[PDB]
CSV table of C-alpha atoms in Angstrom, one decimal:
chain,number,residue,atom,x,y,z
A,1,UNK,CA,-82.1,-54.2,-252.7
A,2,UNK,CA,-85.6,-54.8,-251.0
A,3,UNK,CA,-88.7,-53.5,-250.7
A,4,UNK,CA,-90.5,-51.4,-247.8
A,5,UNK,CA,-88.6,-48.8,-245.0
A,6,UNK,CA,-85.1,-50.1,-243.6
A,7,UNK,CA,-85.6,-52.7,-240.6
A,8,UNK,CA,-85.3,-51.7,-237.7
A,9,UNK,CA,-83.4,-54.1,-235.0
A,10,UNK,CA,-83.2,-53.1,-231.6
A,11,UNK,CA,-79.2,-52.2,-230.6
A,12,UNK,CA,-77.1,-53.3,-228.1
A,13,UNK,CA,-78.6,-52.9,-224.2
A,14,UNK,CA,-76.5,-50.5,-221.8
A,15,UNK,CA,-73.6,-50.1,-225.0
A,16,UNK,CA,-70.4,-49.6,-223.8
A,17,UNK,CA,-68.2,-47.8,-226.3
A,18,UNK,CA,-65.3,-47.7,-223.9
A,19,UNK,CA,-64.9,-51.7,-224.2
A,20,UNK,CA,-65.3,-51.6,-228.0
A,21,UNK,CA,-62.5,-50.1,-228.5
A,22,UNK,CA,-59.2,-52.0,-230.7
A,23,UNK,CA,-59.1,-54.9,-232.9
A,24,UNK,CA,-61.7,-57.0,-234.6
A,25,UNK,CA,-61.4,-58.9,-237.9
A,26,UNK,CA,-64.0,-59.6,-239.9
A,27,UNK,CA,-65.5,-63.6,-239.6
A,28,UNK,CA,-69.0,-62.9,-242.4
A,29,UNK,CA,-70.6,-59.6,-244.0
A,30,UNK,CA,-73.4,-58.8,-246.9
A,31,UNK,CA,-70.8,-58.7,-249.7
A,32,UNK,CA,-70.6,-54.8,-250.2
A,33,UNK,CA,-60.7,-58.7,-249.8
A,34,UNK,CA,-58.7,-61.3,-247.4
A,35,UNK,CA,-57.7,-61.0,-243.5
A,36,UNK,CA,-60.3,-57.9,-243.1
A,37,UNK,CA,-59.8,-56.0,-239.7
A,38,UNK,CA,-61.1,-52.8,-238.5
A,39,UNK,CA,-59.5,-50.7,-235.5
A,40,UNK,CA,-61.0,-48.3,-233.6
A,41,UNK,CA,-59.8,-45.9,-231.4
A,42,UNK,CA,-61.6,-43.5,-228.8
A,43,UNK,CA,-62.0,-40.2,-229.8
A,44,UNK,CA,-64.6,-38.2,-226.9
A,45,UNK,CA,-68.8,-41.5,-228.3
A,46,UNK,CA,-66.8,-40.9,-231.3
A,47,UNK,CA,-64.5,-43.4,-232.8
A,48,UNK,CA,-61.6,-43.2,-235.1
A,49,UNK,CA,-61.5,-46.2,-237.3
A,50,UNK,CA,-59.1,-47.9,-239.5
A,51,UNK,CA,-59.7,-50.6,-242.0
A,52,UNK,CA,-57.3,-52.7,-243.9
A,53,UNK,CA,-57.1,-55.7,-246.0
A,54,UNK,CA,-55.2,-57.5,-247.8
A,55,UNK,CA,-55.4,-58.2,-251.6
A,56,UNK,CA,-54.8,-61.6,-253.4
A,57,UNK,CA,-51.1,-60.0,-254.6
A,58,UNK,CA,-50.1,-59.5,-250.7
A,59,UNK,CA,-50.8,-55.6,-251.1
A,60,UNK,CA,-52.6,-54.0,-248.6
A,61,UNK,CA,-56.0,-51.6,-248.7
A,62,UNK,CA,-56.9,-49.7,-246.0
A,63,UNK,CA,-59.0,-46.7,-245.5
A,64,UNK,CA,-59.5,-44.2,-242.4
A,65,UNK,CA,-62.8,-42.6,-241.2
A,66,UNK,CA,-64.6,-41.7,-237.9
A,67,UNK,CA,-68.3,-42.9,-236.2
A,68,UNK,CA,-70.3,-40.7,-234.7
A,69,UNK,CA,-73.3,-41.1,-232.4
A,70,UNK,CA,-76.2,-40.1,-234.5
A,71,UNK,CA,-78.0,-39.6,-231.3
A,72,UNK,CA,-77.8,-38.8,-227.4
A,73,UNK,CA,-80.6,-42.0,-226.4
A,74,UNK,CA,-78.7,-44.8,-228.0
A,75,UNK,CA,-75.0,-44.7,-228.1
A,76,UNK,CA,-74.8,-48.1,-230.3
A,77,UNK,CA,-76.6,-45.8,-233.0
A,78,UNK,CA,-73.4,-44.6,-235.2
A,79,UNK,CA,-72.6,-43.1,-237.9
A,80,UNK,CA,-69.3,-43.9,-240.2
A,81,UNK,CA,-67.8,-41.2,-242.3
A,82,UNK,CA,-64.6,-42.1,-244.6
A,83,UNK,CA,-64.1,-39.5,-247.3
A,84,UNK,CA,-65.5,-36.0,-247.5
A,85,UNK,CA,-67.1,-36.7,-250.6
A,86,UNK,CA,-69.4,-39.6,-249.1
A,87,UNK,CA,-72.1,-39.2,-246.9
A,88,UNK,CA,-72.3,-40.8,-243.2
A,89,UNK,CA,-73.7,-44.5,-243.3
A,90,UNK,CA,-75.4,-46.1,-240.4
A,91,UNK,CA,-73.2,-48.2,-238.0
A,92,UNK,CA,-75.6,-50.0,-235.7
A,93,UNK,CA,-74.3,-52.2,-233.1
A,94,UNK,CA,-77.3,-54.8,-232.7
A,95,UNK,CA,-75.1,-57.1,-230.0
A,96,UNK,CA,-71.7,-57.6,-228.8
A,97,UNK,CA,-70.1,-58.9,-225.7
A,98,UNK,CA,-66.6,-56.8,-226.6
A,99,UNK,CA,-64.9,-59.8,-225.8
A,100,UNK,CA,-65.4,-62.3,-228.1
A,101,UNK,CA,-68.4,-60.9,-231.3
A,102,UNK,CA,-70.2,-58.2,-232.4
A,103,UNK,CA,-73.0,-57.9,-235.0
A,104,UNK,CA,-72.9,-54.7,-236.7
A,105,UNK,CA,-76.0,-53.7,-239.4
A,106,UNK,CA,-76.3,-50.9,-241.9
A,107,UNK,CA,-79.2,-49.5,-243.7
A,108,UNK,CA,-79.9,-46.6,-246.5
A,109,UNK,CA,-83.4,-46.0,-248.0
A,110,UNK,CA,-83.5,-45.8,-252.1
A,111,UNK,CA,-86.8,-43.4,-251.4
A,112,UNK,CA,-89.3,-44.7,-248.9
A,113,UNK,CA,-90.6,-47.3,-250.6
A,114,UNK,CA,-87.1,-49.7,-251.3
A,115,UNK,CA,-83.8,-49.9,-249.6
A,116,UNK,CA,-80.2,-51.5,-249.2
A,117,UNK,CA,-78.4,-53.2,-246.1
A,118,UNK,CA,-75.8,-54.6,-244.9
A,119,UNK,CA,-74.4,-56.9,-241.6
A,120,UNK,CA,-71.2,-57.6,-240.4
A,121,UNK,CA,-70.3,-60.2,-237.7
A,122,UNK,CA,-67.0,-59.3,-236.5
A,123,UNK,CA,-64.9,-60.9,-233.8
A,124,UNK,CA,-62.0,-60.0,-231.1
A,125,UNK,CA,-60.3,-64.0,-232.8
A,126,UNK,CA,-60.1,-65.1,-236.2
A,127,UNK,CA,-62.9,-67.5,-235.7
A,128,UNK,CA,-66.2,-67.8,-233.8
A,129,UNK,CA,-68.1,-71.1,-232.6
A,130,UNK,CA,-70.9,-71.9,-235.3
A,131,UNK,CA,-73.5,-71.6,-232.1
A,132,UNK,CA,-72.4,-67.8,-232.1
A,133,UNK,CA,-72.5,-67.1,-235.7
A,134,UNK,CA,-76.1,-69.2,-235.7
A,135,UNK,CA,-77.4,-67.2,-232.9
A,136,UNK,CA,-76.3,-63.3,-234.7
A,137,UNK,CA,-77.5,-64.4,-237.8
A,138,UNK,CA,-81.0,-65.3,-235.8
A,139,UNK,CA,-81.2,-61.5,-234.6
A,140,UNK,CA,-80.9,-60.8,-238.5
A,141,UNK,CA,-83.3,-62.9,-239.8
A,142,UNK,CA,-85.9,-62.2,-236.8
A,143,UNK,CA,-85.9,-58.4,-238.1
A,144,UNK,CA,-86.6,-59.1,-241.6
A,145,UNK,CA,-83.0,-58.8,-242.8
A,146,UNK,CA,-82.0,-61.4,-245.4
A,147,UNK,CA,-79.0,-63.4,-244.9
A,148,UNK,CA,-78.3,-65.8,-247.2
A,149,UNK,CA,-76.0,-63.7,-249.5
A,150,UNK,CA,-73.8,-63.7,-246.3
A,151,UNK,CA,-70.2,-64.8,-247.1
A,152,UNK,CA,-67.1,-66.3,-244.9
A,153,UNK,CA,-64.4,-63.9,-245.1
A,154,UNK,CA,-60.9,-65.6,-245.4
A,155,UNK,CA,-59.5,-65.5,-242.0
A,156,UNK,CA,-57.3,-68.4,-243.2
A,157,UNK,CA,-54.8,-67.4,-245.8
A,158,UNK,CA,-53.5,-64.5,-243.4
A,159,UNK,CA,-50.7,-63.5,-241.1
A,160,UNK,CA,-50.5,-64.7,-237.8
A,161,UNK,CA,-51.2,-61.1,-236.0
């Protein structure tokens, strides 16, 4: 929660959707789970996504949605749907090489004057190099996005997939 209009941060240059596509776990996020992974498939910019989890017991949480391009200039500029009951949420690719990491930032307005966000660095591996990690959380904190209440998701105490 924070004051002013959401940031911002300029999206990923020439975005590819087509090499986005598949596998990436989760490595740190704005705590909103173990092993997090999100899937995405091409639809036709679109993308069908699946997310699961998995829960201190061994169970398994997982929910389905879709991304949409909000717009026809930027095709990093999504939006994520899950249930028919929520609206979209922003899902702004800020950088990725779709090899290796990808930053991912979300922002809703409480009126104009305060709002909430939220950043995920996710990864093609279960791990990044620190110097990568460092270097997305620099495009964070250089557009006025706080991230210290970032948190290392446990990559560790997961099947080998």
């Amino acid at each position: 929660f924070h004051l002013g209009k959401c940031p911002n941060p300029p999206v990923q240059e020439n975005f590819d959707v087509n090499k986005y596509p598949g596998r990436w776990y989760e490595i740190e996020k704005i705590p909103t789970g173990r092993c997090i992974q999100a899937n995405y498939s091409l639809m036709e910019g679109k993308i069908k996504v699946l997310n699961q989890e998995l829960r201190a017991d061994g169970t398994v949480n997982q929910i389905e949605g879709e991304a949409t391009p909000v717009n026809l200039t930027e095709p990093a500029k999504l939006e994520v749907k899950f249930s028919w009951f929520m609206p979209s949420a922003p899902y702004h690719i800020l950088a990725t090489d779709y090899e290796n990491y990808a930053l991912v930032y979300s922002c809703t307005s409480i009126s104009q004057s305060f709002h909430v966000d939220f950043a995920w660095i996710l990864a093609r591996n279960v791990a990044l190099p620190p110097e990568t990690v460092d270097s997305l959380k620099n495009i964070l904190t250089s557009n006025n996005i706080d991230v210290k209440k970032m948190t290392v998701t446990d990559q560790v105490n997961c099947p080998k997939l």
